[PDB]
Structure formats: C-alpha cells, structure tokens
Curated annotation (Swiss-Prot), chain A:
It comes from Homo sapiens. It comes from the Eukaryota. This is Cohesin subunit SA-2. Belongs to the SCC3 family. Component of cohesin complex, a complex required for the cohesion of sister chromatids after DNA replication. The cohesin complex apparently forms a large proteinaceous ring within which sister chromatids can be trapped. At anaphase, the complex is cleaved and dissociates from chromatin, allowing sister chromatids to segregate. The cohesin complex may also play a role in spindle pole assembly during mitosis. It is found in: Nucleus; Chromosome; Chromosome, Centromere. Phosphorylated by PLK1. The large dissociation of cohesin from chromosome arms during prophase is partly due to its phosphorylation. Interacts directly with RAD21 in cohesin complex. Cohesin complexes are composed of a heterodimer between a SMC1 protein (SMC1A or SMC1B) and SMC3, which are attached via their hinge domain, and RAD21 which link them at their heads, and one STAG protein (STAG1, STAG2 or STAG3). In cohesin complexes, STAG2 is mutually exclusive with STAG1 and STAG3. It is linked to Mullegama-Klein-Martinez syndrome: An X-linked neurodevelopmental disorder with variable features including intellectual deficiency, microcephaly, microtia, hearing loss, developmental delay, dysmorphic features, language delay, congenital heart defect, and clinodactyly of the 5th finger. Holoprosencephaly 13, X-linked: An X-linked form of holoprosencephaly, a structural anomaly of the brain in which the developing forebrain fails to correctly separate into right and left hemispheres. Holoprosencephaly is genetically heterogeneous and associated with several distinct facies and phenotypic variability. HPE13 features range from full alobar holoprosencephaly with cyclopia to semilobar holoprosencephaly or septooptic dysplasia. Dysmorphic features include microcephaly, hypotelorism, low-set ears, micrognathia, and cleft lip/palate.
Swiss-Prot record, chain C:
The modification Phosphothreonine is found at residue 74. It is found in: Cytoplasm, Cytosol; Nucleus. This is 64-kDa C-terminal product. Coiled coil: none annotated. May promote apoptosis.
Length: 240, 534, 75
C-alpha cells in the first residue's frame, strides 16, 4: 500500500523509481492465505474474530485502492450471506467502493462469484440436483441482494447490468450436453438465478438481451416445452 | 367564541372580563352561550337552537350535533397539530380557571351554575365521538383540577374562623357563617364527587393513551395540591395500577406524578405503606425497555431513600448497583447518584484525612462486583456527582506510597492494582474531558469553564505525579499490570511546568527508572508503554 | 365517509387489566453492558469499518509513519 503507484498522488515524482507492482504469484498467494485463514468455519472468540476482521480489512484495502487485480474480489463476494454477521459490513463497503472504481469490472466480479458457486454445486452435488431446495435457494437469495446493490443510478448502470446478463448467457450456453443436442444445453438452470437481475434493465435493453438470447436458443428449442426447459421458459418470461 | 381558541386568543384575564360583562346582564344566557361556544370548541360545526333540547333532555343534542359534524380530517382542535394545538391547549385551562376564580365562592357555591355545566361535561365524556371523548377529559377533568383549589381555600377560612369561634348577633353571625361555611363545603364536595365518579373512574383506563395520560397527570396535580383529602389509597391506587401500562408516555406520567409527592415530601406516613406495597415494581422498572423511563424510575428510588432508609433491602440495592456499569449514560448517571447518596455520603492532608475511607470503599466495590475488569465506566458514572472523591489524587497517591499507620490494615496487592487503575482513569477523564467510548457524542466544543477545569486539573496532575512517579515506579516495578498502568501518566502531564518549576532531577529519575524497566522486562506491552512514553 | 375514528372499544377489560398486572415480564429488559476490558474498548474504538479502512494493519504509532501510510489513501 505504501510503495505503490499512489506514492505520486499530487506528490513529488522524484520517487517514481520505488513504485512496486505485485506479481500474479503474490496476488494468488495473498488470496490463498485469505481464503485459508480468514473465511473459516468466551474471550478467544472475539480475539480471533477481530484479528481475522483486520486481515480481511487489509486485503479489501488492496482490492479497493487498485493495487491487486479486481477480479480477485469474486472469491470475497462469494461469501456475503455465509458471513453476514462475522464479516458482512466489511464486504458491503468493499462492494460499495469497488462499484465506483469500475462498475463494468465490478459486475464481472459479481457474476464470476455467482458462476463459481454454481460450479461448486456441479463439483459434487450432481447435475440432477434438486433445483428446488437447499443451496440453490441460497444462491437465489444472494443474487437478490447483489441485484439490490446495483441501484438504478442510471449512470451507465445499464451497461454494467447488460454485460452482467451477457456473461450469464455465455456461461449458460457454454458446454453442450453430451447425451444429445435434442436435449437442453448444460448449465441452463442458471438462467433462473439470472432472472433476479432482469428488473434492472429497462425495456430496450430487455429486448436487446432477448435478441442476444436468440443467438443460442433456436426456434425448435424455443417451442420445446418440457420440465427440463422450465428455467429457460422462466428466463424468457422474465425478459418479456 | 371558539375562534379565540382557534387563533390562540383564548385567555384568562380578558376572557373573565368578558364573562363578568356577560354576567352583568345575566347568567340566563351566559350558560347557553357557554355551552354553544364550548361545543364548537371541539372542532365540529353544530348548532344551538333556542329550544334545541330546552323542553327535552340536553343529552339528546349529542347525535343532533354529531350529524352536523363538518368533518374534514381526523383531528380535533387539540389533535390538529401546530399552533392550533399548542396555543389551544395552553389557552383552554385559562377559561375554566377564570370562571372558577371569578365565581369567588359564589354562584357555583349557590345553585344552577355549577350544576348546569356538570350535565354537558358528563355527556361528552361518554360520547364515542373523538371530539368530545378527547377534549372533554381535557376540560371536564381539568374542571375538578380547577375546583379542588377552591375547596382548598374553604379549609383556610374555616380554620381562620375556627379561632374566631374558639373563644349575640355577632355570635349568631359566627353561627350563621359557620353553617354556610359547611353547606357550601358539602355541596362543593358533591360537585367534586361528580367528576371523579363519572368523568374520572371510567376515563382513567380509556382505550386511547392520551386521555389516560391526562387522567394521571391531573391526579398527580391533585396529590401535590392537597396533602390530606387527596392522599388516601382510595385515591392513591390508580397510579399503582397503571404502573404496568404497555405504553411509555403513560408510564412516564405515572412515575412523574408519584415522584411529585416524594419531591419535597412531608414525610407522609401512609405513603411509606404505598412504597413497600410497590417496591418490587418500582425497582424492576430500573431495567425497562424504554430507556426514557428507567431514568425517572431510578430518580425516584433515591428520592425514597432520602427519607425512608428502610424499605430497600440488600439485593434490591445491589440490582441498582450493577446498573452503574451500563451503556446508556443517562441511566448510568442516575445510578451513580443513587450509589452516591446510598453508600458514598457519610489531618487535612494524608492517609488519615477525609475522603480516605470513602476512597477506600470504591476499590472494595470494584474488586467485589466483577462485571468489568477496567474501571473507566464506574469512574465516568459519577464524574458529575462525586467530583471531589474522584479528583483528590493526593490521597490516592498516599494510600499506595505512605507506609501503613499502626492501627490500620494495609491494602492487599490486588486492591493496590485496582487503585492504580482507578487513579489512571481519573487522571484520564481529568486530562481529556471526553467521556469513554460508547457514552457521549465524541465531539464537543468545550466551554470556558471546561477549559479552565482542564488546565487546572492537568497542572495539579503534573505538579503531583512529576514528583511522585519515580517512587511508584520503583516500588511497584516488578508487577506487569502495575507498571503498564503507571507508565501512562507521563502522557497526561503538562511538560511545560517541568521547565518553569526547577523539577528536573525528577525527570532524570523518571528516565533512569524507565531504563530499569526496559532492561528488566520482556513483556510485549510493557515495552510498548515505555516507547510511547519516551 | 366521516373519518371520526369512532370505535366501540373505549375502555379495557378487567381480565386484560389483571393480565397486565401479573405479566410484567414483557415490558422489562436485560442490561446493556459497555466493554468489560481495555482490549474490547480499543476494538470498539478502531473496529468500525471506517477506521478499518483508514489505518495500518501493523500498528504504527508515530505520526510520521502514519502519514507515510495514509498519504497513499486517495479519494
């Protein structure tokens, strides 16, 4: 934080030599330490709580003041609800500050966290997951708040939420299903989560995102009304 | 008419002048107009016909005027906020008081005037019209509040005439004036029963909270106005009942009314029984949900304790004692006063002088109650009441440095450490005149008196610990907590007095002792204290 | 639509009165205590996120070094 490119903030540039840009190796090691020794589940309770809060505050400082790449904030935004009491008001402030710096990249980080939770479920739970109970409900509950955070200032919030939907669509239609192309595309239940962000767009952007949705749908799949397609029907009705 | 109340022009002097001018003509229509104006004073737009109910029952006029409501919004004259509320509420009482005072022990003490008004007031109290049910209690109850003083004057004359009768047409005149002094009294007494029985007994527990608040406030006024007639459980019980109301304004009003009697108390004997029958609740209100009620509940326990030093037991006072380590400074201050005037009330310089046993008791208190390990909160909860016990460091230093006097028990190691903590926290709240974190705004523009107090306290602190500290840090120089709590005082010393006082050998001693601590201790906080002091 | 707010309930039930008289355990509360130790007092001083995002992690006491850090705090 002290020897960064901020050392010349309306200050003497004679100190240009000692500007240190951390390498990707260190940017990965810091995140590994944070996710291993901060997010973890008397007097020793508050002891460790405040110590871990200080450590998370330091890393969030490096994220907000743009010393490390913003994309690493996904692995912190991934745990807003699971720690709303332990570390929630820190992460909310990090989000409020990371919105101001770059809204576009903030939306990218948000929807990358939402796409790593989904992959967390796919990594063990099973693709035929309940889709109606447990941790999917938690993901939807997180998505609701994360959509509420992006208030309609209309200050280019349109592009942020549009690029957010774009990422969602491209992640949904990423891997075709092996069984057959006569069956739904993989990772399509996500569109049900993506529905919480629909209200943020206005009508014109809703239509534009629909036309971009036609870039992967195909008429035959549009008319295909089955239970396995319920999420796609829900997303379409959301965009209408 | 009611427009005087609407514009706020309703008053006492000029209104009574107008009422007396009307009486100069007659009282035959001074009642028709009195009823007509008061009816519209609620806020509706009714009518008064010459024989609207003249041959009939006047009470019938209720629904007839209710139909002519002219309803615009749900707000009576008092409910209508702003000046139309404040001025009208202040003004209303003036007219009633003026009417009573002009009565001058006549007309109302005669006939057909006091009786006339009673009917209208009674009817309004019952009407489920928001107007009458609200503003009648504002005025009809108030009328009892008005006449009790009139009866209060009746006793004075009786007592005065009693001596005149103590001891012909002069004696027969005494006899006549005495019969009439009784006939009026008795009839005024029935006119009282009128309100209490009808206007008070039922409206006392009315559904809406504001009317109950008026009832309780007027009952407290009665208590303060008469210390006999209205000081009997027959009247001293309604407050005890509504002491468990679920609102907060009503509870505050009952507590205030009760505090009135204990305030400048006449040591009423029956009041002592009331205290005991309700001590449990008045003490359990010390932890009420609304922190605006616990303050006025604790300021009543001290008031009781001032005279009745027996109703409170040991666990009852200990419950209050634990409250001084609170989070709300307004309740903590009151707990501090209760502790002060319960336990901390009771050779000009020295360990044997004053504020010595008093300052020896507080360390015992802190070492007994074990809710906190630090003393800042206790010190702050008394910084506005005990301003001489927690400021005379000359004895706090003495009690830790001066050798124990034969015939006096010395302090234990733990008691000494606690005293060092108390000393340091007193030093801190003297130097930085800001309360501890959690209590207080945190920003305050210190007044001239506060700046003067700061300068004087810092000067004394320097002039005292600059010469005292090396000895302290040489005797208590093996104990961690003690050194880490005594090495902070340097930070609170005006270092300018060092130069213009020739006190420099003590500076050399202080630096030498600090070096001795550094070269002998290895704790991660002791050395921090030394570095910060340097 | 005369908004008189006239309601039938203008009194209280004696059953409810005695219920309030007896069940006074719903209007009282517990005690809110302040920091019980110095460390908790400190952590209430600096634990606020506004201070968490405006102070060094390793505590630096001298104002010189505090400026060395905090001058890197931009808008």
């Amino acid at each position: 934080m002290i020897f960064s490119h901020q050392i010349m903030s309306g200050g003497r540039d004679m100190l240009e030599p000692l500007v240190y840009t951390p390498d990707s190796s260190l940017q990965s090691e810091l995140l590994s330490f944070i996710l291993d020794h901060v997010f973890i589940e008397e007097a020793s309770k508050i002891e460790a709580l405040h110590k871990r809060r200080n450590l998370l505050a330091a890393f969030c400082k490096l994220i907000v003041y743009t010393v490390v790449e913003m994309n690493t904030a996904a692995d912190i935004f991934k745990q807003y609800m699971k720690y709303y009491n332990d570390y929630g008001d820190i992460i909310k402030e990090t989000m409020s500050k990371t919105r101001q710096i770059d809204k576009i990249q903030c939306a990218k980080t948000l929807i990358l966290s939402l796409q790593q939770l989904f992959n967390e479920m796919i990594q063990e739970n099973g693709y035929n997951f309940d889709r109606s109970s447990s941790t999917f409900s938690g993901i939807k509950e997180l998505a609701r708040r994360f959509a509420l955070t992006f208030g309609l200032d209309q200050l280019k919030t349109r592009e942020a939420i549009a690029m957010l939907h774009k990422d969602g669509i491209e992640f949904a239609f990423k891997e075709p299903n092996p069984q057959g192309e006569s069956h739904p595309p993989l990772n399509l239940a996500f569109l049900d989560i993506l529905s919480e962000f629909s209200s943020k767009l206005l009508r014109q952007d809703k239509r534009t995102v629909y036309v971009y949705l036609e870039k992967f749908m195909t008429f035959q799949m549009s008319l295909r009304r089955e239970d396995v397609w319920l999420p796609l029907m829900s997303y379409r009705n959301s965009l209408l | 008419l009611f427009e005087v109340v609407k514009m706020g022009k309703s008053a006492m002097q000029s209104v009574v002048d107008d009422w007396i001018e009307s009486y100069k003509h007659d009282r035959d229509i001074a009642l028709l107009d009195l009823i007509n104006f008061f009816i519209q004073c609620s806020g509706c737009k009714g009518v008064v016909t010459a024989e609207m109910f003249r041959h009939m029952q006047n009470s019938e006029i209720i629904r007839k005027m209710t139909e002519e409501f002219d309803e615009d919004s749900g707000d009576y004259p008092l409910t209508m906020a702003g000046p139309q509320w404040k001025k009208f509420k202040s003004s209303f009482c003036e007219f009633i008081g003026v009417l009573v005072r002009q009565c001058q022990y006549s007309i109302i003490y005669d006939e057909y005037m006091m009786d006339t008004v009673i009917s209208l007031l009674t009817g309004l109290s019952d009407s489920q019209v928001r107007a009458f049910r609200h503003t009648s209690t504002l005025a009809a109850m108030k009328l009892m509040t008005a006449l009790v003083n009139v009866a209060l004057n009746l006793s004075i004359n009786m007592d005065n005439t009693q001596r005149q009768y103590e001891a012909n047409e002069r004696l027969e005149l005494l006899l006549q004036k005495r019969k009439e002094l009784q006939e009026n009294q008795d009839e005024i007494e029935n006119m009282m029963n009128a309100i209490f029985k009808g206007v008070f007994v039922h409206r006392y527990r009315d559904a809406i909270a504001e009317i109950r608040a008026i009832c309780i406030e007027e009952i407290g006024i009665w208590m303060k106005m008469y210390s006999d007639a209205f000081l009997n459980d027959s009247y001293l019980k309604y407050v005890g009942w509504t002491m468990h109301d679920k609102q907060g304004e009503v509870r505050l009003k009952c507590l205030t009314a009760l505090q009135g009697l204990y305030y400048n108390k006449e040591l009423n004997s029956k009041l002592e029984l009331f205290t005991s029958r309700f001590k449990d609740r008045i003490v359990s209100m010390t932890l009420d949900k609304e922190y605006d009620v616990a303050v006025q509940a604790i300021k009543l326990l001290t008031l009781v304790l001032q005279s009745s030093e027996e109703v409170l037991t040991a666990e009852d006072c200990e419950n209050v004692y634990h409250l001084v380590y609170s989070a709300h400074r307004p309740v903590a201050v009151a707990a501090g006063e209760f502790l002060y005037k319960k336990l901390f009330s009771r050779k000009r310089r020295g360990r044997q002088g004053p504020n010595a046993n008093l300052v020896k008791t507080l360390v015992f208190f802190f070492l007994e109650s074990e809710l906190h390990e630090h003393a800042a909160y206790l010190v702050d909860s008394m910084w506005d009441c005990a301003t001489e016990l927690l400021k005379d460091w000359e004895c706090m230093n003495s009690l830790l440095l001066e050798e124990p006097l034969s015939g006096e028990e010395a302090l234990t190691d733990r008691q000494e450490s606690a005293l060092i903590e108390i000393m340091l926290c007193t030093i801190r709240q003297a130097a930085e005149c800001h309360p501890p974190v959690g209590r207080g705004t945190g920003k305050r523009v210190l007044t001239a008196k506060e700046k003067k107090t700061q300068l004087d306290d810092r000067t004394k602190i320097t002039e005292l610990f600059a010469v005292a500290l090396p000895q302290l840090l040489a005797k208590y120089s093996v104990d961690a907590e003690k050194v880490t709590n005594l090495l902070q005082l340097p930070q609170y010393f005006d270092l300018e007095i060092y130069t213009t006082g020739r006190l420099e050998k003590h500076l050399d001693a202080l630096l030498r002792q600090i070096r001795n601590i550094v070269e002998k201790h290895t704790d991660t906080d002791v050395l921090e204290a030394c570095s910060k002091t340097y | 639509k005369r908004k008189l707010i006239v309601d039938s309930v203008k009194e209280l039930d004696s059953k409810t009165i005695r219920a309030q008289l007896s069940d006074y355990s719903d209007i009282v509360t517990t005690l809110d205590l302040a920091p019980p130790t110095k460390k908790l007092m400190m952590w209430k001083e600096t634990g606020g996120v506004e201070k968490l995002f405006s102070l060094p992690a390793q505590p630096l006491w001298n104002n010189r070094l505090l400026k060395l850090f905090t001058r890197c705090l931009t808008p």
